[PDB]
Design a protein around this ligand. Structure first.
Ligand code: NI
Ligand code: NI
Lengths: 837, 837, 140, 140
């Protein structure tokens, strides 16, 4: 065969398209992935026939699928489909535009080549909301306010077309443009940023120019007016215009004035809010739908001055001397800048540019050129050494932190980073039996081996040891070796003696203690474990008890002040299929038999509907502060984020807005829930200063999202200022977009680069021992700290302390005397519109 | 499932076979890949049935497909199909020989197991050239000229057979062979090299022996006659023959004489030219078709003396004391040798052996043993520490250089090396928006990160910085950090001031400047950019301007002496589908709207049929010297080679042979076009002393091609004397050939070996700073040089300087006053016979 | 005495009878690069301020008498990245005439005073017997 | 075995070696003035040779550790350029394994007079007023 790599990936695309074809043939409404796969594969097959031209397939691709063959969200999620295909002329790109544009598609065209029976149009059932929509006001914003303005008359004496950008210095335009070059000094076109004005040969146009702001320094272009804006440089520029032969004709009666906040001012350029949001992303007061959920994030504020947005492209703002600063020290220029980004964080939902330098979030605010723009600080200068990432219409979020990973395989690392998790904390050594059940890395030899094996991966890593011992010796040994925490587990012995020993060791070493308590109640009930805590800080994994813990009342720990509670994802939210799944999964895990009464009694005592339904409310009100994975140990590493937002959606459906929220937006709920997997795990584990939020000085572990895909599939995962993972298409494509578009690893994953972008979190004892030198780790290594004085009040936005009471018989849960109960959710968002399987 | 790694690959093979089955069922004629996939998959399914023997499937595989179910080239491309399958008695290899041997195949057998409807034989349409054929003369070559010859009478007294090779010392043969051992001293069988004479037990034969040449030293065998050929050693050998009991019987009247250039001489052995070309590959005067193209490469000369070809195998020349030297220093022994290779290079098209030592091309000439052969120099000795690569009937070409790579993903690196590109020059940091448009690596941090990430890849790498600045500060900073060139780009500002600044910096630092001129004509027209050049050397990317540049007449730079122009592949050659593809590709790239008149006007001004037709003539006459990719930025990395040859084919179809060519061969055109991606990029970028040609002293970045597959899919890519990538079959196969045959990475890609075989090209400023030590690079690092005094006359075979004139209105292009116009090509070679998708 | 000999002067080489005459001098009289308290090489006077950081010399030997097989001259030697970056006149092109871009004294430039000293290329000894490592110290 | 050799002049045996070879390379040697025309002239001192410089001294030596430490690969943990080997065969040793010194006398010491008997015979040696290998050789 001699198959090249692109043939292999195209064969995978064809297999996905054939799966979509079978599903379409049996009459199900396809989702986004299936529709894209079908359209791409059918375009490839029609190209393989060789009886069509590229334009014919551009027209044909719009007829394959209609609105009735796809889910109601697909027409909004699916704007175009690029694909490469080998015609008789060779490989050609062909792109379908708005492929879903009819009520019904041509199903014979859609299933062509598959040799499957074409289904009748009746087979597609009938039953909406736009994922990622921007809800704007019906207002026209006004650009370039408080500036000196002049309306000039320009005529082209050239024989070729001449576009000029919005921020290009107008006195330095092509010499074959004739106009009053004296009145264009220190001026730029008063038009929307990133747009242009075109002068066809001989064309005559009346333009409006507004003064540049900032330091008012002209650089670049033709070097006609190289220098600050003043009278002497104006005379020098006019002498250069006359000498070098640049078109100049005085217009004595030109119109002069100022741009005002006036609808009837002749110098003002207006732009509708919808057009503004389409061009640069939403501004203050707009709202964003988070995926296909019911949550609306309103932009609390916006750092941009309208008219000076940093837009990169051909003939756009970020260019030499216009939006790329040129006359500044090389060493204050940003390494990277994410432009026009909507930042969702636990602190707020804002619109800003994120400047990244040396792998840290250098600044958040307005970027650009202080020579040309107002409001640009010295930590936000875009220089000639600055890479640009376009955040127009994308959401920037901090990389998620998963604090309950079982290192059972290295493929869960790829699955986690592909979903936007940049930090894993947990324990394990592989698929050994001890780590399938526990997040313990027992041996120091295994600690060294796991720190060495994960050294090249572009994630932050933290490993915990086995704290289930009644004497402190081996705990000291494993903390000294690199363990940043200890784990008490029922399978090693989670008795009160072990709890006391592990907690005094934690107070000695300033590490966090994770506990999975005794489900059998063999040494005592939950009150005796709480007594063993002795008021000391402790993190409780899966505090509900579905993952495990004192049957039935482990959930009482959500009311204790010194206990930091967390939840695992497989119960988030309660749904119709949750109990059967969890019961029989528990039976599989524990090798239990349904036919023996004791085994089924244990299973039913441990998997409880009422206590999970209470867990949902406790997550909503802030009594549970962290949502983790428990990966491959009753947990899914790639669903910490999505499941969290699903919970939020459910709690808006069945409880309405929170008290702090209103009918306008869901900003407080969004902040509370995004804190559960970004900042609260970081505070709990003791590395809050490095990761967990989009804050200046923190590591640049960022995740880009389309608002239509928020919570399911990110556009790219940036690790330490470099793109670690991203959605990319065919490597042999003419552009990056053509199918198959997969979440692939980028240059941040190769060589010794992935270690240069990330941190290995260890204990203070291990860093004092310089385990990064002993083990030969290329990664950065930092010590965890500030975890022993923590109470529930330190969890951001999740500091509630209800008085929990569980009935021993009926398992009814009351918080402050009020019953906690929520209905089962028959559906969830962020699941079915997005995933092939 | 517990799927082992081989089951996954066999499942992929089955998927490819099922795709081929669906295509065959709808009645298209399969290509090579589809036919191989179908035959292998069907053999696997018949084995899975368990009702067939291996012989039954050997016979059955020849009847699945006929000549009417496959393209006309497939019967010549497809000689056999090996496949490994699980029969009821375990895993067995079954291989089909000449699987296309009927007009029509058994379509029920071909589609067996798929449950698809068998198509009637009428559905396959009707419409020849042999890919890779060797056109030889009707002449018989004569072996071993000017040697002393004796015809002896040998008889076997053994009870089991004795086969003797062509170069084995005949006095050293099995003791049970009786013959005149005195007349066999210093003699070897006068037969074709690598062949043998078989003595069945009791068999009595008459053989002809000719003297060995060179130093005439006998080594190895039975150690009967070790030493130089003389009288004293003859007497010692005869004493050893008598003592050790070797069969000896004097033949007083044995015929003796000399081998002559005479057809009717009794001592001469003749071999036909077709048999010679089949056995050892073509010799002087033969012709080779390059793939399925129109082009015929004639062997200009051959370094081989007929009779002493270095052939490796069982009982063949390269053996201890016959073709493997024994009495030389271990150090002068070659590390490896490519034998009997046809070398296509811009210098010439020759037949030679390539000796590689320490990762460099140690020598080109005749390899072997100077003790036994004439014409072997001390830099071409095959010793006991020499690996052998068989170039018999294969073409060896220098690894291609792609000078316009956008480092958007690391998968394009695999795509490039799998197609024969060994050196990438360009810029980028990942899928950031700044690098999807430009080949700029802006930050020094990103320069370090990218040099570290590509440290283990087995390719040569060169990174360029962002030169679009009006002051030199950040340009100095990024050149000092590792950048070996700068890119001026319209997206950052490609104005005359930036051009002047970047060019004076280039003159300072001795790096090359690549430019993407201003398409908007915002600061100047093309004459003003040329004025900004000020006669200084500059590389111009995609000089035609489809990729971008001054609308419509950037192509005028092809006439400027100091400009080194290049073209990108997606316009190479003009075909019927090119304009629609490029128009709508530009529309998606620049986010343009077809319904806005200005946007469509810009798009039509940029994508022009007349200049895209002009660049074909300009590449043919040599006015365009380099063909690059522009990978994933309107460019395909894996088609730099194929597209180039496609253009050559087109320009032979529509213009005939060049002036320097004749009706016999196309050697000058082949050299001119192979210079466009091997040597000219190397000269332009400043590392032509290391890579870019099959020349002694250069790095051994070689690509071995089957002549039928030349230009599409190489047999292997050697990097620094080690096989970096190769076409290999199932890992669990009994031999390397069985399907699925994929181009896989070899041991050159693992560990710290990939860096040991490559060069990272940096600036002189960076090598003086020792960035290979600062960044911890295991790769070799060299400085680029000799790029500022270059003119068009330094590009090899592409030094033409036509006087170009473009019409402002009609876009008509004239070179020296003559209209340049080429017809659209409705088909191309090297595309459809070879690729699955 | 102040800056070292200029064109036409002569220097006795040690206590030998050999006189090295300065063949030529790159200095413009009045703009000698002298480092010290209240001297020429200062910010904005003889130390340049308005140039890229990366063209500044790493080191500059000032007012040096260079004896070499090519000639016996008087010049400043600019060193950058461990190589002899340039030989000529160092200083500030804002204030001084005859300063090229490879001879700019910036704020990242170390100064060695060659006033009245002779500069020679390090000798090459091609017949060393590596009998001990102490001869290396004696040689250097 | 490792080539840890010591070359002595027979007139100087036991006091001052001519050279100490470590792993086939001269580690230390008696050498004279570095600027002498030959190695012999005074002051002749025992000086360290090229075996003691750079990463050569580790290339010629062995760091003896336990088996537990070699299993842990402490040569990799600590970044040692020296060769590392495990000690072994020390638990089954008796007096009879010491070469040429395997005698086992029955020793008896008097508690009061400290008189020592071996196999019942008094052990007594006179004090030596002089020793060789001390005064003919050492300056101090
Ligand atoms: Ni757990
Ligand atoms: Ni370009």
């Amino acid at each position: 065969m001699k198959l090249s790599p692109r043939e292999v990936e195209k064969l995978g695309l064809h297999n996905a398209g054939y799966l979509a074809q079978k599903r379409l043939a049996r009459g199900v409404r396809l989702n986004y992935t299936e529709a894209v796969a079908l359209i791409a594969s059918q375009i490839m097959e029609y190209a393989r026939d060789g009886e069509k031209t590229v334009a014919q397939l551009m027209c044909l691709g719009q007829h394959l699928l209609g609105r009735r063959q796809v889910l109601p969200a697909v027409p909004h999620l699916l704007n175009a489909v690029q694909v490469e295909a080998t015609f008789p002329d060779g490989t050609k790109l062909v792109t379908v535009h708005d492929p879903i544009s009819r009520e019904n598609g041509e199903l014979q065209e859609a299933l062509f080549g598959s040799l499957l029976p074409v289904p009748s149009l009746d087979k597609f059932a009938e039953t909406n909301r736009i994922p990622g929509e921007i809800l704007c006001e019906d207002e026209c914003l006004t650009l370039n306010i408080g500036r000196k303005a002049v309306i000039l008359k320009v005529t082209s004496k050239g024989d070729r077309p001449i576009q000029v950008g919005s921020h290009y210095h107008f006195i330095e335009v092509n010499p074959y443009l004739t106009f009053d070059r004296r009145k264009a000094y220190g001026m730029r076109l008063n038009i929307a940023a990133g747009t242009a004005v075109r002068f066809e040969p001989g064309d005559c146009k009346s333009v409006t120019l507004v003064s540049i702001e900032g330091n008012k320094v002209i650089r670049g272009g033709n070097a006609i007016a190289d220098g600050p804006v003043n009278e002497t440089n104006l005379e020098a520029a006019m002498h250069a215009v006359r000498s070098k032969g640049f078109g100049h004709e005085e217009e004595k009666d030109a119109s002069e004035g100022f741009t005002k906040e006036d609808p009837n001012c002749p110098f003002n350029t207006f732009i509708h809010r919808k057009e503004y949001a389409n061009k640069y992303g939403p501004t203050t007061g707009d709202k964003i739908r988070l995926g296909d959920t019911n949550l609306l994030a309103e932009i609390e504020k916006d750092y941009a001055l309208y008219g000076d947005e940093c837009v990169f492209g051909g003939g756009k703002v970020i260019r030499d001397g216009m939006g790329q600063s040129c006359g500044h020290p090389p060493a204050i220029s940003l390494d990277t800048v994410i432009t026009n980004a909507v930042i969702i964080d636990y602190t707020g939902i804002i619109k800003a540019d994120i400047g990244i330098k040396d792998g840290l979030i250098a600044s958040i605010g307005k970027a650009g050129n202080p020579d040309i723009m107002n409001g640009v600080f010295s930590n936000m200068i875009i220089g000639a050494n600055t890479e640009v990432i376009a955040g127009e219409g994308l959401i920037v979020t901090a990389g998620a932190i998963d604090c309950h990973v079982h290192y059972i395989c290295p493929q869960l690392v790829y699955e986690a980073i592909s979903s936007g998790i940049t930090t894993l904390v947990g324990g394990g050594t592989g698929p050994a039996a001890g780590t399938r059940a526990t997040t313990c890395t027992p041996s120091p030899t295994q600690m060294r081996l796991m720190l060495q094996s994960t050294d090249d991966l572009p994630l932050n890593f933290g490993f915990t040891g086995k704290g289930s011992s009644s004497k402190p010796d081996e705990l000291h040994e494993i903390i000294k070796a690199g363990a940043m925490g200890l784990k008490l587990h029922e399978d090693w012995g989670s008795t009160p003696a072990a709890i006391d020993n592990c907690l005094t060791i934690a107070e000695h070493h300033d590490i966090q203690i994770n506990i999975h308590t005794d489900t059998l109640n063999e040494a005592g009930f939950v009150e005796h474990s709480i007594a063993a805590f002795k008021g000391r800080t402790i993190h409780t994994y899966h505090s509900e008890g579905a993952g495990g813990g004192h049957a039935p009342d482990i959930i009482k720990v959500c009311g204790i002040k010194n206990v930091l509670p967390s939840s695992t994802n497989p119960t988030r939210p309660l749904t119709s299929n949750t109990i059967d799944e969890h019961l029989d999964m528990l039976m599989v895990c524990h090798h239990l038999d349904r036919e023996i009464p004791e085994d089924l009694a244990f299973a039913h005592s441990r998997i409880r509907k009422k206590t999970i339904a209470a867990e949902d409310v406790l997550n909503d009100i802030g009594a549970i502060s962290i949502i983790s994975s428990d990966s491959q140990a009753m947990g899914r590493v790639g669903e910490v984020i999505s499941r969290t937002w699903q919970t939020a959606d459910k709690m808006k459906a069945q409880t309405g807005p929170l008290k702090c929220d209103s009918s306008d937006n869901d900003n407080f709920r969004i902040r509370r829930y995004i804190a559960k997997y970004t900042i609260n795990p970081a505070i709990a584990n003791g590395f809050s200063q490095y990761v967990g939020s989009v804050e200046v000085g923190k590591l640049a572990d960022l995740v880009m999202w389309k608002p239509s895909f928020f919570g399911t599939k990110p556009e790219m995962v940036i690790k330490g200022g470099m793109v670690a993972w991203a959605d990319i298409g065919d490597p042999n494509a003419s552009i990056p977009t053509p199918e198959p578009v997969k979440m692939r690893p980028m240059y941040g994953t190769l060589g010794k680069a992935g270690g240069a972008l990330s941190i290995a979190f260890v204990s203070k004892a291990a860093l004092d021992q310089r385990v990064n030198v002993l083990y030969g780790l290329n990664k950065r290594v930092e010590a965890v700290s500030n975890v022993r004085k923590l109470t529930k009040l330190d969890m951001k936005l999740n500091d509630a302390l209800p008085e929990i009471t569980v009935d021993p018989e009926s398992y009814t849960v009351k918080a402050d005397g009020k019953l906690l109960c929520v209905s089962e959710a028959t559906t969830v968002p962020l699941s079915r519109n997005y995933f092939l399987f």
